[PDB]
Design a protein around this nucleic acid. Structure first.
Ligand code: MG
Ligand code: ZN
Ligand code: ZN
Lengths: 182, 73, 928, 186
RNA sequence: CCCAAUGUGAUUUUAAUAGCUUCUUAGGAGA
RNA sequence: UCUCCUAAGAAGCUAUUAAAAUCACAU
């Protein structure tokens, strides 16, 4: 309505400027135009301000909406991990050590020693191979282990007949030996 | 300037071997890394030019990896 | 003639075959170490001894052996007193045999005493020789190692036969002194029992005991009622303490009937609480120590009680099995399914700790409980495979995957257009003083685990506690300048959120995700849980890809977001106060630009008299740092919390910093290993904890310099009184003397003026005092690092300067020059020319090799190159003008390629200021 | 200037300078200065829009240059590195590097890394008798500016060939390419 | 694929504040 | 009526501060 007052005051002044009219009434017309223009500049400045604030409101709402979407997406990933790891624990071997303890409480480092079904040995040279893994079964951690596989540093499979003092320069050390609890 | 040009050529030559997937052989990459790291620490050009002949012989042994008759133009 | 009848009386009733060690009737003279405190003098120093004539036994087949008869002369009142006290302790097996007799010299009667079958050296000579080490003056240490069969005399013909890092076999040679030291500890407890049940009072010291453990010199002691004797032992046990771990003295406590010939004790595998064994070990060896010991540090009264009790635990935790320490786990139910989770910890220093907020049954997990259970190693290590990794000596826990990961490092990309430009300007000529020395070095798949194995330089170190408890109160006087305390999650500032969250959280996002997903009441509730519970966490080790002078790998520790997020909220208010201060000892936060380098150097020069400069190096610093000195650094930072945290909240904070960045599980190559100690560089307090350790080693060197000086040679009566008071406050007061901690800090801050920034330091010092021994010098830093840091510091890596108009030789890898700027002279920093040329030639990404994309990359290198223009070597001064001429070339080529691509030029010609010196000169003038 | 208000601005200041140069009454100079002040203000408003439009276009032109030229650097990287290496190896002009490169054009390629220590083993493929004639001399082979002594020669079917058999007239009977095994001599 | 902590500089963009300039409106004073 | 001024509205310029992004350097 301030724009409509400004526009109609412009035409009311301009029709008098066209013919020249009289300054007596031209000053009164100019004052009406400048008063209406000043109120129009107040409304137009506030409208332009509110149009700038409308983007700030909507972009802050999109930031909140994406922050709840990402909190929901990571929460089910942490649950999916924890409720997957829980399936790998063989409760028959784990309950036997936890029931034997004074307080139902144990060190963490003895769980893989006393409960793990599978061992990996990483070996840097043939002298260390002869000391730790010679043959097809070996003893470690007060238990007996049987070799299921050997691989080299390229993840190629190595056969137990290839590992000798004569052939050792040809292999890609370290070897990784994988064994099952007997 | 030949000592600086040999050290700069060694940086480009191992960068060509890395792009030909030589990292996919643990036994061979560990020799190329030792030849490269020695050429950069060298102070006699006669040591650096011997280690450069061994390092370039890796690239020339990879038959069909580079079109050498097109790179020599 | 007369020496023969004297010699036959010195043999006396005993079966012995003596040869004299000098002239027949006059005394011998020897240089020996003494723990001394008197009206005239105090200290632990070498003195001449003149009272004694010495004889040595031959065996019954005419060969000399390690058994001496030592004879001395007395005033008759002192002869009667020492005979009176000897006849009370006469029955004890810990006492050397004495004979008392009168004989004639110079025509008159003199009372003599003879002491039978002593060793050449005492316990004080062993303790001085290892605590005051110097490799050019080793003759007493060499003679001790050969006499007791630790090694052959040919061992000392090796290069570096003492370097713990270059010859780790020296640890086997020092461990052969182990039971010879353990038998002296047991005889001390027998002698203290004899003094008490005889009613005798007196101070016992290391110089009055031989290397078979037998005691003498009863002339100082006095009588009391027979039930009520008192041995005084503070200086004896405290000076000896660092030798007990270095010689591995208690190694026999790990055998059947503590007999080295019997097998090891087979400990029960499920046991973790060794509290009754720790109390049984204290009463064997330290029975008369006279201050309360707590096996578990959750019971301690203050920080000084935590350091006292943790120092005994580092000694006793060497007897117990390695699988006993680390997280303690329990089985719990979530919606009826069984989890395995951490509900405590067993520490080598702090003892057993249990969590206060354990719940055995739960219906659901919040976001905060999913973070705690996903950070905790319990579920990862219990579900992973067993691992036997023979590539390292560090203890390996489990493998999390069926395959081992081998990580390589690749070469740098070559910026050929800059090298072709530099060679056209005459760089890289044969015989040039400027050349390429900085490169990117490639690494094979063995590098990550080869760098991890260096944690082998971390060895269990027991401190002198009477010294460490004075040094920690003078080290704290460097931190009175600053405020500190806890803050809310509303107030925490994070520098960059697009950086790793650590394991396992890097599967799902960068640090931005976890700060966006938790509200400030989820963040404050995670922090308030750690004041009551221990959260153990996993740390990744990551290889760096960056330019260097050296071909060996570098790794950094990627600490987990639950550790960083709660450590920021505890420490950040102090760390922001250290970086905002100016004109203090710690210079973290001060810039080199706008006159800031000149302001730093004129602050160390201060009001020092006869000033020289020096600077030093710490070998293997992050790997070798003792757990006792990294605990002390966290207690000194935590002293700001008196207003906002109770004693119990400050203990559970300390147990969390230990369990997360000191002794911890490291994720390397896809497998878990236990880290033995030292700094994890990547810890939220990394640079600030290194600065506390750096001040502590520099204050320690000044205690050792002043106490090992002969106090009769000091000419200034003020410094004789300072040395006397220092010994009383160190070894004879049991509480802090605030007026002396202020007097020693005021002395030190005038004569030894430091500037410190993490592991780098400069000191400006009074050379007239340092050459008299009244303040520290580079020889006193060798000795402190040898017994307190387990590294040998070679003087070839240290520096010193005599003329202050040249400035320090290096600080922060930059050199200094004094140059005219306006009407007056100023100090400017300058880099190594090879460094700035190497960063132009070699880059870590392919797109960095087009200069038209990267012009402001060369503007930044020219801001660092500018001070080279003022250097007297023209081959250095040409390096700045190369960078300005290249920046001009790149803007001409960018302008040409832009017009060829779009047929229109840029209107922004304002690049024109970056190829003229006035933009770069303004970086180094004051008034901004 | 292209700005239209400039014209007005210019004619307004010309009329204001004309009035003071003519010595006109100060109320006329004020009226002319006032019409100049609005004409200037509208010219400055048009110039503010020019200042924003010129930056907006130059920022988009700069970002398109950086976007397109980063992709060209990243896509051609394998072809660029191989062309760069074989340009630098020409400038060194070392006789051993030249000798192995010239042999590899003809197919005289090594099966091993070339060894540096004395009495170490080398193996090299020989394509045809034309290469054998240049490379071999009696018991010896010449390669990488070094002399090697031959310890065996083997054909494409893995049979051993004696050094008396390899001659121009007999050469069509052999199963080329041969492998030569040799040992470093000094 | 992985990619720490701490401090400093440069560059770019945006916002705000302060001042200046012009126009207009209103009031007062002066001539 | 003119002039000056005091306040408000609008446009133009400038300085400074804050935040974000990028490059570089040191422990
Ligand atoms: Mg230094
Ligand atoms: Zn205690
Ligand atoms: Zn607090």
């Amino acid at each position: 309505p301030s724009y409509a007052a400004f526009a109609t005051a412009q035409e009311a002044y301009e029709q008098a400027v066209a013919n020249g009219d009289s300054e007596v009434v031209l000053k009164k017309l100019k004052k009406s135009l400048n008063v209406a223009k000043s109120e129009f500049d107040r409304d137009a400045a506030m409208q332009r301000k509110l149009e700038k604030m409308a983007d700030q409101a909507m972009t802050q709402m999109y930031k909140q909406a994406r922050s709840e979407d990402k909190r929901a997406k990571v929460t089910s990933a942490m649950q999916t991990m924890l409720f997957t790891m829980l399936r790998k624990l063989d409760n028959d071997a784990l309950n036997n050590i936890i029931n034997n303890a004074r307080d139902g409480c144990v060190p963490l480092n003895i769980i893989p020693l006393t409960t793990a079904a599978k061992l990996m040995v990483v070996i840097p040279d043939y002298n260390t191979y002869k000391n730790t893994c010679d043959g097809t079964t070996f003893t470690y951690a007060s238990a007996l282990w049987e070799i299921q596989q050997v691989v080299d540093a390229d993840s190629k499979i190595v056969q137990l007949s290839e590992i000798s003092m004569d052939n050792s320069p040809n292999l890609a050390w370290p070897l990784i030996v994988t064994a099952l609890r007997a | 300037s030949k000592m600086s040009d040999v050290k700069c050529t060694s940086v480009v030559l191992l960068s060509v071997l890395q792009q030909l997937r030589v990292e996919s052989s643990s036994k061979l990459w560990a020799q190329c890394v030792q030849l490269h790291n020695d050429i950069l620490l060298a102070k006699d050009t006669t040591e650096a030019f011997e280690k450069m002949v061994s390092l370039l012989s890796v690239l020339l042994s990879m038959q069909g990896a580079v079109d050498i008759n097109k790179l020599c133009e | 003639a007369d020496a023969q009848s004297f010699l036959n009386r010195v043999c006396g009733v005993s079966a012995a075959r003596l040869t004299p060690c000098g002239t027949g009737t006059s005394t011998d003279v020897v240089y020996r170490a003494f723990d001394i405190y008197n009206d005239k003098v105090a200290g632990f120093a070498k003195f001449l001894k003149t009272n004694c004539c010495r004889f040595q036994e031959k065996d019954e087949d005419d060969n000399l052996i390690d058994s001496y008869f030592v004879v001395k002369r007395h005033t008759f009142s002192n002869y009667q007193h020492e005979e009176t006290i000897y006849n009370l302790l006469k029955d004890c097996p810990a006492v050397a045999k004495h004979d008392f007799f009168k004989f004639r010299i110079d025509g008159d009667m003199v009372p003599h005493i003879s002491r039978q079958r002593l060793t050449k050296y005492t316990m004080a000579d062993l303790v001085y020789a290892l605590r005051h080490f110097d490799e050019g003056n080793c003759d007493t240490l060499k003679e001790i190692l050969v006499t007791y069969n630790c090694c052959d005399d040919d061992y000392f013909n090796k290069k570096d036969w003492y370097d713990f890092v270059e010859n780790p076999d020296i640890l086997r040679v020092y461990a052969n002194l182990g039971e010879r030291v353990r038998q002296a500890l047991l005889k001390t407890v027998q002698f203290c029992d004899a003094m008490r049940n005889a009613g005798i009072v007196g101070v016992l010291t290391l110089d009055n005991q031989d290397l078979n453990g037998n005691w003498y010199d009863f002339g100082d002691f006095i009588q009391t009622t027979p039930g009520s004797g008192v041995p005084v032992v503070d200086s004896y046990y405290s000076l000896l303490m660092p030798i007990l771990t270095l010689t591995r003295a208690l190694t026999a406590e790990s055998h059947v009937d503590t007999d080295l010939t019997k097998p090891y004790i087979k400990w029960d595998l499920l046991k973790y609480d060794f509290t009754e064994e720790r109390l049984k070990l204290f009463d064997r060896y330290f029975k008369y120590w006279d201050q309360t010991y707590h096996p578990n540090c959750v019971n301690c009264l203050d920080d000084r009680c935590i350091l006292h009790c943790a120092n005994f635990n580092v000694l006793f935790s060497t007897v117990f099995p390695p699988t006993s320490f680390g997280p303690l786990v329990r089985k719990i139910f979530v919606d009826g399914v069984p989890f395995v989770v951490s509900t405590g910890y067993h520490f080598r220093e702090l003892g057993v700790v249990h969590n206060q907020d354990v719940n055995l049954h739960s219906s659901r997990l919040s976001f905060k409980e999913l973070l705690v259970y996903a950070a905790d190693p319990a579920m990862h290590a219990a579900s992973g495979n067993l691992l036997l990794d023979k590539r390292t000596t560090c203890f390996s826990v489990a493998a999390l995957t069926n395959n081992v990961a081998f990580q390589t490092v690749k070469p740098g990309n070559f910026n050929k257009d800059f090298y072709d430009f530099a060679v056209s300007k005459g760089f890289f000529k044969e015989g040039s003083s400027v050349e390429l020395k900085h490169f990117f070095f490639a690494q094979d798949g063995n590098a990550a685990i080869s760098d991890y194995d260096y944690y082998r330089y971390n060895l269990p170190t027991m401190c002198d506690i009477r010294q460490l408890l004075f040094v920690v109160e003078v080290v704290d006087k460097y931190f009175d300048c600053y405020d500190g305390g806890c803050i809310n999650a509303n107030q925490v500032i994070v520098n960059n959120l697009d950086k790793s969250a650590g394991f396992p959280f890097n599967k799902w996002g960068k640090a931005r995700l976890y700060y966006d997903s938790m509200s400030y009441e989820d963040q404050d509730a995670l922090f308030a849980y750690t004041k009551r519970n221990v959260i153990p966490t996993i740390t990744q080790m990551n290889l760096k890809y960056a330019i260097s002078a050296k071909n060996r790998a570098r790794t950094v520790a990627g600490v987990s977001i639950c550790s960083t997020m709660t450590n920021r909220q505890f420490h950040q208010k102090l760390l922001k106060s250290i970086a905002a201060t100016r004109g203090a000892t710690v210079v973290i936060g001060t810039s080199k630009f706008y006159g800031g380098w000149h302001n730093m150097l004129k602050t160390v020069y201060s009001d020092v008299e006869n000033p020289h400069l020096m600077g030093w190096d710490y070998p293997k610093c992050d790997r070798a740092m003792p757990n006792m000195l990294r605990i002390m650094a966290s207690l000194v930072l935590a002293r700001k919390h008196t207003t906002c945290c109770s004693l119990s909240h400050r203990f559970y904070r300390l147990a969390n910093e230990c369990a997360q960045v000191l002794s911890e599980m490291v994720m390397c190559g896809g497998s878990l290993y236990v880290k033995p100690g030292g700094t994890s560089s990547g810890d939220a307090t990394t640079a600030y904890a290194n600065s506390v350790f750096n001040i502590c080693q520099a204050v320690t060197a000044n205690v050792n310099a002043l106490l090992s000086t002969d106090g009769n040679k000091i000419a200034d009566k003020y410094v004789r009184n300072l040395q006397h008071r220092l010994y009383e406050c160190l070894y004879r007061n049991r509480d802090v003397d605030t007026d002396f901690v202020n007097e020693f800090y005021a002395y030190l801050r005038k004569h030894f003026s430091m500037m410190i920034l993490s592991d780098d330091a400069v000191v400006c010092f009074n050379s007239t005092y340092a050459s008299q021994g009244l303040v520290a010098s580079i020889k006193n830093f060798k000795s402190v690092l040898y017994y307190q840091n387990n590294v040998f510091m070679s003087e070839a890596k240290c520096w010193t300067e005599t003329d202050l108009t040249k400035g320090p030789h290096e600080f922060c890898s930059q050199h200094t020059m004094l140059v005219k700027q306006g009407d007056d002279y100023v100090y400017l920093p300058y880099p190594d020319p090879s460094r700035i040329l190497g960063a132009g030639c070699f880059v870590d990404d392919i797109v960095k090799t087009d200069g038209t994309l990267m012009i402001e990359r060369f503007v930044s290198l020219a801001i660092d190159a500018y001070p080279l223009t003022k250097h007297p070597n023209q081959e250095y001064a040409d390096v700045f003008h190369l960078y300005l001429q290249y920046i001009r070339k790149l803007h001409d080529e960018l302008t040409g390629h832009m017009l060829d691509m779009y047929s229109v030029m840029l209107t922004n010609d304002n690049t024109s200021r970056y190829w003229e010196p006035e933009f770069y000169e303004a970086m180094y003038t004051p008034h901004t």
